[PDB]
């Protein structure tokens, strides 16, 4: 679903800061590729869905969101 960074979601360029999309763009697509499971599923929204857990993840890890709705590189 992401191919460089901006195609990241609005909800989520509207509040990571810069290299979070990176981060959650890079994630999201490892979690992506990892999703070898639901690969043949017709259900492969789910998959979309994990990698954005996932990605977020990430996110969250390097990434944190302050007491509004916005996020800001912790690590």
Partial sequence: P??????LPESVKHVLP???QDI???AFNSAW???KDKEDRRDDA???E???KVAWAAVKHEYAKGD???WHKKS
């Avoid at 992401?2 to 195609?7: F, I, Q």
């Fill in 50 to 52: 994990t990698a954005h």
């Fill in 33 to 35: 590729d990892q999703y």
């Fill in 24 to 26: 959650y763009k890079e």
């Fill in 68 to 70: 509004d709705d916005k």
């Fill in 2 to 7: 992401y191919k460089t960074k901006s195609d």
């Fill in 18 to 20: 810069s290299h979070a």
């Fill in 46 to 48: 789910s998959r979309e």
